[PDB]
Design a protein around this ligand. Structure first.
Ligand SMILES: [K+]
Ligand SMILES: [K+]
Ligand SMILES: [K+]
Ligand SMILES: [K+]
Ligand SMILES: [K+]
Ligand SMILES: [K+]
Ligand SMILES: [K+]
Ligand SMILES: [K+]
Ligand SMILES: [K+]
Ligand SMILES: [K+]
Ligand SMILES: [Mg+2]
Ligand SMILES: [Mg+2]
Ligand SMILES: [Mg+2]
Ligand SMILES: [Mg+2]
Ligand SMILES: [Mg+2]
Ligand SMILES: [Mg+2]
Ligand SMILES: [Mg+2]
Ligand SMILES: [Mg+2]
Ligand SMILES: [Mg+2]
Ligand SMILES: [Mg+2]
Ligand SMILES: [Mg+2]
Ligand SMILES: [Mg+2]
Ligand SMILES: [Mg+2]
Ligand SMILES: [Mg+2]
Ligand SMILES: [Mg+2]
Ligand SMILES: [Mg+2]
Ligand SMILES: [Mg+2]
Ligand SMILES: [Mg+2]
Ligand SMILES: [Mg+2]
Ligand SMILES: [Mg+2]
Ligand SMILES: [Mg+2]
Ligand SMILES: [Mg+2]
Ligand SMILES: [Mg+2]
Ligand SMILES: [Mg+2]
Ligand SMILES: [Mg+2]
Ligand SMILES: [Mg+2]
Ligand SMILES: [Mg+2]
Ligand SMILES: [Mg+2]
Ligand SMILES: [Mg+2]
Ligand SMILES: [Mg+2]
Ligand SMILES: [Mg+2]
Ligand SMILES: [Mg+2]
Ligand SMILES: [Mg+2]
Ligand SMILES: [Mg+2]
Ligand SMILES: [Mg+2]
Ligand SMILES: [Mg+2]
Ligand SMILES: [Mg+2]
Ligand SMILES: [Mg+2]
Ligand SMILES: [Mg+2]
Ligand SMILES: [Mg+2]
Ligand SMILES: [Mg+2]
Ligand SMILES: [Mg+2]
Ligand SMILES: [Mg+2]
Ligand SMILES: [Mg+2]
Ligand SMILES: [Mg+2]
Ligand SMILES: [Mg+2]
Ligand SMILES: [Mg+2]
Ligand SMILES: [Mg+2]
Ligand SMILES: [Mg+2]
Ligand SMILES: [Mg+2]
Ligand SMILES: [Mg+2]
Ligand SMILES: [Mg+2]
Ligand SMILES: [Mg+2]
Ligand SMILES: [Mg+2]
Ligand SMILES: [Mg+2]
Ligand SMILES: [Mg+2]
Ligand SMILES: [Mg+2]
Ligand SMILES: [Mg+2]
Ligand SMILES: [Mg+2]
Ligand SMILES: [Mg+2]
Ligand SMILES: [Mg+2]
Ligand SMILES: [Mg+2]
Ligand SMILES: [Mg+2]
Ligand SMILES: [Mg+2]
Ligand SMILES: [Mg+2]
Ligand SMILES: [Mg+2]
Ligand SMILES: [Mg+2]
Ligand SMILES: [Mg+2]
Ligand SMILES: [Mg+2]
Ligand SMILES: [Mg+2]
Ligand SMILES: [Mg+2]
Ligand SMILES: [Mg+2]
Ligand SMILES: [Mg+2]
Ligand SMILES: [Mg+2]
Ligand SMILES: [Mg+2]
Ligand SMILES: [Mg+2]
Ligand SMILES: [Mg+2]
Ligand SMILES: [Mg+2]
Ligand SMILES: [Mg+2]
Ligand SMILES: [Mg+2]
Ligand SMILES: [Mg+2]
Ligand SMILES: [Mg+2]
Ligand SMILES: [Mg+2]
Ligand SMILES: [Mg+2]
Ligand SMILES: [Mg+2]
Ligand SMILES: [Mg+2]
Ligand SMILES: [Mg+2]
Ligand SMILES: [Mg+2]
Ligand SMILES: [Mg+2]
Ligand SMILES: [Mg+2]
Ligand SMILES: [Mg+2]
Lengths: 79, 97, 65
RNA sequence: UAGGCCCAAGCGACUGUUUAUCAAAAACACAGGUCUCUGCUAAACCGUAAGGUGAUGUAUAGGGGCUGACGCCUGCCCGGUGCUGGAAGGUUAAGAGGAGUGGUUGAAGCUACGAAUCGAAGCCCCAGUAAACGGCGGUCCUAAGGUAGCGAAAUUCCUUGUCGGGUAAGUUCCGACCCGCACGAAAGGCGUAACGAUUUGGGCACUGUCUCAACGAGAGACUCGGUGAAAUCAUAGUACCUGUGAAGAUGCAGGUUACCCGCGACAGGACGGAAAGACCCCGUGGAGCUUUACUGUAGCCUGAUAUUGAAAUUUUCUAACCCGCACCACUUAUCGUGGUGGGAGACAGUGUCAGGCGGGCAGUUUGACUGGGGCGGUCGCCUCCUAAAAGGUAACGGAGGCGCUCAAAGGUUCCCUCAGAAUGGUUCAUUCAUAGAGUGUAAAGGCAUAAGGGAGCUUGACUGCGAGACCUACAAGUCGAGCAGGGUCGAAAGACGGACUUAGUGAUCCGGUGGUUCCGCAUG
RNA sequence: GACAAUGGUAGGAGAGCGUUCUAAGGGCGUUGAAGCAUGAUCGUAAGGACAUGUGGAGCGCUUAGAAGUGAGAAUGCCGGUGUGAGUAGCGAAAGACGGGUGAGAAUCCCGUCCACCGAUUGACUAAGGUUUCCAGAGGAAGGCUCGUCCGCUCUGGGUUAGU
RNA sequence: GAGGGUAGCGGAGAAAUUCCAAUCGAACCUGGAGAUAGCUGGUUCUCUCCGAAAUAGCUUUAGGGCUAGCCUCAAGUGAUGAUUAUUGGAGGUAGAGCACUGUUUGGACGAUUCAGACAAACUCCGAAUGCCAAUAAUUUAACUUGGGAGUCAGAACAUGGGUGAUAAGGUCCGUGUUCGAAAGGGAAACAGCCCAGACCACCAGCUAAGGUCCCAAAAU
RNA sequence: AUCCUGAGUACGACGGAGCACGUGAAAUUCCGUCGGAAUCUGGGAGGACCAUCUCCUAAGGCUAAAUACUCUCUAGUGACCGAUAGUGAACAGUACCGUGAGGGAAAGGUGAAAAGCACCCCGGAAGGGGAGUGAAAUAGAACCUGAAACCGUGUGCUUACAAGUAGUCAGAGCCCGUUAAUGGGUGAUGGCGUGCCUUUUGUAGAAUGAACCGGCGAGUUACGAUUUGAUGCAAGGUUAAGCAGUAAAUGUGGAGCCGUAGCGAAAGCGAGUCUGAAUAGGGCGUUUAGUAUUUGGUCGUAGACCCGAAACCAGGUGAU
RNA sequence: ACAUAGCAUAUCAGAAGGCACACCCGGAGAACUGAAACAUCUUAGUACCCGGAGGAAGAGAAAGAAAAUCGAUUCCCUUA
RNA sequence: GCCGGACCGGCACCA
């Protein structure tokens, strides 16, 4: 007969990218959900208390290289 | 009924109370006061007679929406500040009765 | 006979000008040490009955205007 | 027409009784035994009561429990439960009692509460009680660890135990052994003559039970005259084989076979007829039953108070109340009602209120998931893999963690850089060392901008918010720039609305506490 | 006129057919209404006509209104009639022949012989039934066949108490 | 034998759940009463247009229900929908590799080095795809608000995986198709495979899958 | 106001009950038990309670009308039934069933008029064939009409080598001749072809249901809600009960209801308001359309689409 | 003891029982059911049973409603 | 939680 000691999992947190490179976003739009800095805050982008990356102004999202092994996301005004 | 899930009106809290002595007034605006000619004395009886006010409630309150454009002596139970100012500034007068 | 109002619901909602129902918020009775300051501050603010819930419960408050 | 008999074993002593209609028995009863209650208006029982049964009886009697003639006997345990008896030490209700507090009008008054203290039974405690409920293990422990007798048994799982007898051959039987899975002394132990439509083994007699069937008689069947139903039934001109198919085909495919219609026969199929499967599961279905399930309740016990009085200090008295107590009358009357004596007596009974006991009786509850159900496991939250390089994604798939902690382990400014190894020294020093350390805690993602280490100051682990987003059926959950009010650190730019991030939680209703430019039922 | 669309369960939407009743209008009918029956008729469907026969007194059409408004299934309810089928059965047993009656006789009556019960298949009380008792007449149905017979049908009768 | 008595929350019981008027774990009759039935069965004329679902979440919930998803009807809005091309991006699978963690086989040297292998929870690396967006070609939706639903048993096949045994016409998820709700041709017959979507009529024609000796159309 | 004006009363405590109101801050009314006032300078009520004010005057009784019902009677009515309907009952609480309480049917129609068939014939009769009556007797009493299942008689085509959901498409032969239509009946022979309903992932299914035929047999109505269509009026819209009228339309009736203003728990303020210290920000609002009646759809309360439990309770009937 | 109870007589005829007992007043009073279980609650003071009457019954002449005042009871509309 | 002894013992307990 027997039984299993497993069978547990937490709810999935729906992390990852929320806006695309080259997309226009209003200020405050969440750009990236993550644990830790998998992607860094770049220009006009903030990092929240739970590592969320969000736009500080309205503009266009740009995911870019940051050094050799890191990356960042910025937001540039359309003008 | 939600099939045994706690219903919305049980999961939300009750709020507030009903005032037993609550007063509600029949409201007349200045654009409604336009109907009468200049120099007329407006009373609650006159308002009910001409049909502007259907039910008197706890009294008659004059409110400041719209434009008056007439000179009147308005006798009512309550006036808003803007309604009183507009009545007085159009050449007329108001009195709380 | 006349339809009966749902008395608990009538004690919990109010009717807005456009026909919406203003409601209070759950999680506002106790255990406030287990909730953040922002959580309680924003739970202080009222919301509306959602559209799906309204589809379910409209007839319970038909007389409540 | 009229007993078959014998040997041996289990059970029950015996005659009797029982499931009308599948059980007649080893079950019930029984005479006998024992325990217990009961002093008579007995106890017990029926009834709301009156009235009754018990009994026109009176402890050699009546009710209840268990055992079950008779013979020999019936061992240990009173820790637990029940029962019996103590004690008034603690705990508790009505009721008594009023310290005191508030509301209102400087009071009183009215009003809402209200604390010492008193206040029974029960329970907690002690003792006894086992033919009371029960228990009679695994140096250790217990209340105590099975006496006599019996034992592979109506009890023995292994098991057809082993040995002997009976047979040519015996899983049954009889006799022994004891290793009693899991006998055992009145839910009685071991025996027992007689008895049994009882169960079991053996033998004689006897036979169509059988080897192995044959013949004969009669009633049906069968033919004719008369009379004439029924269950069933989608329509039917209703073949077989191999296959196909909801996985077992008269009816589909491909073959094979078969001229049309009766009658007597047989039962392989028509998953044949019959009864909306009794098994099994499911329904927030029902019913009967149980109890240390929940909530009640008939009834019983106990206290206060009313009926309910009079004197001493529990005792006394008589006059209310009571007598299924005697005599007398109504009255040819074991009812009743009055009268007189006697008994008892402010008790009892009864009413109201209170506390306790109360499967005697009642209403109900007693989850779901599940490779059927039960049993086991699981049930919310966090992290990883499965998960197919966005997100999401299941199984009783594979691994772990959480229901906190920290007054700094928070904020800010400044400074600093680790593990390991080798080499020398009775932790100290040098060089390699991108982290191979540390990060409160599980994992993953991050971090030497350090998010890791230390130091000074400090309390932003603020108040009112909040454009805009993420997540999402809802209720919830998450991030958030900026704005204002006041601060902390820093020279300053600036940072700070707890913690490297992600678990550490629980709705509503109701109640408690603090505040309150709110309401407050004619007015205050 | 030239292009497109039109499989469909649960289900949504639309347009219609037919039934009964009502209002108003307009009609049919003993020179034959409704209903029923038959036909080789018409419309995209539900359905609508016509002709003939039967029937014997009511009934269409138009517009609108209102509904007990449409059945093939509920082991549906009621009624009728099949199938099984000339099949099972005809309910413990001894009858035979002669004579009679009669439309008709195994079955009724008479006779002879035979057979069965006889601690009873005999005889008498009670309960229960309630006219079944008797006579004459009858034979549709009842009688498990038949029936001239009967506990059946018709008519008329019958029960007498001081013990 | 006769005459009587005990009655259903009850009687009676030498005790069997036994009997109380042919079925007693609580008789029968009438009434409350059309109890309740998240269950089974049934639900009656026609044609036309559209046309699902068998999923998620929560549920004393699991063959029930609610909200969402998918259908329909009507109003609105108006490029916001679909596909492809180009361009930009997020991410760690296939494969590969051993730089970390772990596993492992031979050498050599005084643990290091050399060579060679293994991994869902290893990664110095890393596709094809798929996804998110931006402005050209093609295309026809898309969204909002209201009225009305049904669905919450799914099945096979192919493929990426778990589980089982690289068993099952097994089971649980991802992806696509078909059945469901789809007739027609093929696969002998054969829901789920292959071809292909039936408005009606024709004794016209061309093809698909599959076929062309006879059954049986077309090549001995 | 000298005297009187309802005493075991009012009231209170405890336990209950009735009040829309479940003991609640519970006023007001009643019952049981126990206690227990005052006396116009009094007493009660105004939702705990106190004070003030206001209203009233318990513990005695009587009292028509507007209201409720229908086994009845009289006079009438119906977009109610028309013999399986409508009462169970058009001819019955009968027949029949049960010990009993109790359950409980079936069954209407000749014809205008009985003129209900004199008489003859077969037959014991029954029943027939004539003859008569009648407009009609296949209107002859088992009587209007006379469907279907089912049972028979006659025969135009066809059938005894054939394997079948019985048809359909093709098709000779034979027989007929119409609502006259590129007709009717039958059918050698060839192709194709496993009923219907329900329930299902999937049913020829060997899963369910139906012997056949006929009749009967299931989303209705009332009152509310919401939405859509229609119509009237429009910053307005509309009456309810009642009264009048013919059981009508309608007239009258403006009480009331929905709109014209929202926001707030509330006091309140008001085109704003709430939050807030804020002249900030944010929520809900303003920046015209409603209302009455009604067709359709859907929901709620009612049994609510129909049939079906095992059971529960109450009052009776049974020991033949 | 007196009386009373009791026992006879004489006169009267008051009660009894029935119903459409439908409606009404009073006593007493369920359960299935709903709450998606169930006990408070609901079904419901309903069904049933019992008593008493009338053409009606019940209520009725303020120790009332109220907050500007009204003026017995009952019933209809509305409040809702 | 209320109280008596040294936690024990009774009582109380309707989000
Ligand atoms: K005794
Ligand atoms: K003891
Ligand atoms: K499973
Ligand atoms: K994943
Ligand atoms: K007799
Ligand atoms: K839905
Ligand atoms: K490696
Ligand atoms: K009280
Ligand atoms: K009454
Ligand atoms: K329920
Ligand atoms: Mg932080
Ligand atoms: Mg944080
Ligand atoms: Mg015996
Ligand atoms: Mg015997
Ligand atoms: Mg038996
Ligand atoms: Mg027997
Ligand atoms: Mg015994
Ligand atoms: Mg002891
Ligand atoms: Mg002893
Ligand atoms: Mg065993
Ligand atoms: Mg024993
Ligand atoms: Mg002993
Ligand atoms: Mg013993
Ligand atoms: Mg014994
Ligand atoms: Mg023998
Ligand atoms: Mg024979
Ligand atoms: Mg024979
Ligand atoms: Mg015969
Ligand atoms: Mg098939
Ligand atoms: Mg197969
Ligand atoms: Mg076969
Ligand atoms: Mg074949
Ligand atoms: Mg045969
Ligand atoms: Mg069978
Ligand atoms: Mg069944
Ligand atoms: Mg019980
Ligand atoms: Mg119940
Ligand atoms: Mg289960
Ligand atoms: Mg299992
Ligand atoms: Mg992917
Ligand atoms: Mg992913
Ligand atoms: Mg765990
Ligand atoms: Mg835990
Ligand atoms: Mg820190
Ligand atoms: Mg007051
Ligand atoms: Mg006040
Ligand atoms: Mg098509
Ligand atoms: Mg179509
Ligand atoms: Mg429709
Ligand atoms: Mg239509
Ligand atoms: Mg029509
Ligand atoms: Mg009908
Ligand atoms: Mg039928
Ligand atoms: Mg037959
Ligand atoms: Mg024969
Ligand atoms: Mg036969
Ligand atoms: Mg035969
Ligand atoms: Mg025979
Ligand atoms: Mg015979
Ligand atoms: Mg005899
Ligand atoms: Mg006779
Ligand atoms: Mg005969
Ligand atoms: Mg006779
Ligand atoms: Mg039995
Ligand atoms: Mg038993
Ligand atoms: Mg017996
Ligand atoms: Mg019986
Ligand atoms: Mg009921
Ligand atoms: Mg029913
Ligand atoms: Mg379509
Ligand atoms: Mg790989
Ligand atoms: Mg499968
Ligand atoms: Mg497989
Ligand atoms: Mg799939
Ligand atoms: Mg389906
Ligand atoms: Mg197909
Ligand atoms: Mg499709
Ligand atoms: Mg094949
Ligand atoms: Mg084929
Ligand atoms: Mg198909
Ligand atoms: Mg060709
Ligand atoms: Mg060919
Ligand atoms: Mg009072
Ligand atoms: Mg008085
Ligand atoms: Mg008829
Ligand atoms: Mg009738
Ligand atoms: Mg005729
Ligand atoms: Mg006729
Ligand atoms: Mg031939
Ligand atoms: Mg041949
Ligand atoms: Mg064929
Ligand atoms: Mg199946
Ligand atoms: Mg078959
Ligand atoms: Mg079935
Ligand atoms: Mg059948
Ligand atoms: Mg039928
Ligand atoms: Mg409905
Ligand atoms: Mg409706
Ligand atoms: Mg709905
Ligand atoms: Mg009467
Ligand atoms: Mg319930």
């Amino acid at each position: 007969v027997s039984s299993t000691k497993n069978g547990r999992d937490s709810e999935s947190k729906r992390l990852g990218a929320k806006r695309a490179d080259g997309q226009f976003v209003t200020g405050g739009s969440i750009l990236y959900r993550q644990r830790g800095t998998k992607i860094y805050p770049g220009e006009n982008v903030g990092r929240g208390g739970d590592d969320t990356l969000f736009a500080k102004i309205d503009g266009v999202v740009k995911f870019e290289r940051k050094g050799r092994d890191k990356k960042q996301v910025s937001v540039y005004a359309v003008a | 009924f939600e099939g045994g899930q706690l219903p919305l009106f049980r999961r939300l809290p009750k709020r507030g109370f009903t005032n037993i002595n609550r007063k509600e007034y029949a409201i007349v605006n200045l654009d409604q006061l336009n109907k009468f000619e200049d120099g007329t004395e407006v009373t609650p009886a006159l308002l009910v007679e001409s049909g502007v006010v259907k039910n008197e409630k706890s009294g008659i309150k004059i409110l400041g929406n719209g434009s008056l454009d007439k000179k009147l002596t308005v006798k009512a139970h309550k006036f808003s500040a803007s309604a009183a100012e507009a009545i007085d500034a159009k050449g007329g007068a108001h009195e709380v009765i | 006979p006349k339809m009966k109002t749902h008395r608990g619901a009538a004690k919990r909602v109010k009717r807005t000008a456009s026909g919406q129902l203003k409601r209070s918020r759950a999680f506002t009775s106790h255990l406030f040490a287990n909730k953040s300051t922002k959580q309680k501050r924003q739970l202080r603010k009222a919301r509306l009955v959602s559209k799906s819930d309204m589809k379910r419960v409209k007839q319970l408050l038909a007389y409540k205007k």
